[PDB]
Amino acid sequence: GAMETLQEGSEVKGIVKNLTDYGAFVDLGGVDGLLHITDMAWKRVKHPSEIVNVGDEILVKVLKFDRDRTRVSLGLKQLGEDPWVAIAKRYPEGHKLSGRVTNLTDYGCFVEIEEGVEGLVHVSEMDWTNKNIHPSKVVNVGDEVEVMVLEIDEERRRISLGLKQCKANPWQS
Numbered sequence: 325g326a327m328e329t330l331q332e333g334s335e336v337k338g339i340v341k342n343l344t345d346y347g348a349f350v351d352l353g354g355v356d357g358l359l360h361i362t363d364m365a366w367k368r369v370k371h372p373s374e375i376v377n378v379g380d381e382i383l384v385k386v387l388k389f390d391r392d393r394t395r396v397s398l399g400l401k402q403l404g405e406d407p408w409v410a411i412a413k414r415y416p417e418g419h420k421l422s423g424r425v426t427n428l429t430d431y432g433c434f435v436e437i438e439e440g441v442e443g444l445v446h447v448s449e450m451d452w453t454n455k456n457i458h459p460s461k462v463v464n465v466g467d468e469v470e471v472m473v474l475e476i477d478e479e480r481r482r483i484s485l486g487l488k489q490c491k492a493n494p495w496q497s
Contacts, residue, residue, distance in 0.1 A: 422469070426442065
């Protein structure tokens with residue numbers, strides 16, 4: 325059960341016998357496969373020990389291969405379906421969703437939609453008064469709020485939301 329008959333996209337279990345700061349190494353039973361840290365999950369994994377430890381037998385998917393057959397690339401997120409690929413069918417543009425500001429910038433506010441999904445609201449569509457108003461005047465990190473889908477880039481892995489879509493119209497009293 326190794327490079328012997330394995331081919332990209334195949335699913336095989338291996339033993340994580342080594343953990344580096346850029347990835348890890350799995351034993352396919354006579355050959356080591358490099359699992360890049362960024363392939364341990366859909367999120368931003370910082371260390372492989374977070375997801376898997378030495379001497380553990382997990383089910384990885386072959387992503388790539390070395391020059392001819394020798395070494396291989398493994399993954400630990402392709403074993404499931406990424407939430408962003410279906411994000412378009414879950415909640416496309418126009419859908420109302422409740423997020424929470426996790427980060428604040430000078431050009432907008434970042435809002436986490438869910439575990440692994442984080443969108444961004446531009447200063448232009450977060451208030452009605454200005455276009456470049458500081459997002460701190462509108463919201464703060466930790467404030468749970470509602471937003472509407474404006475643009476999702478599943479490829480660039482970045483999401484766009486609108487806050488004003490959940491705000492009150494000034495021409496009403």
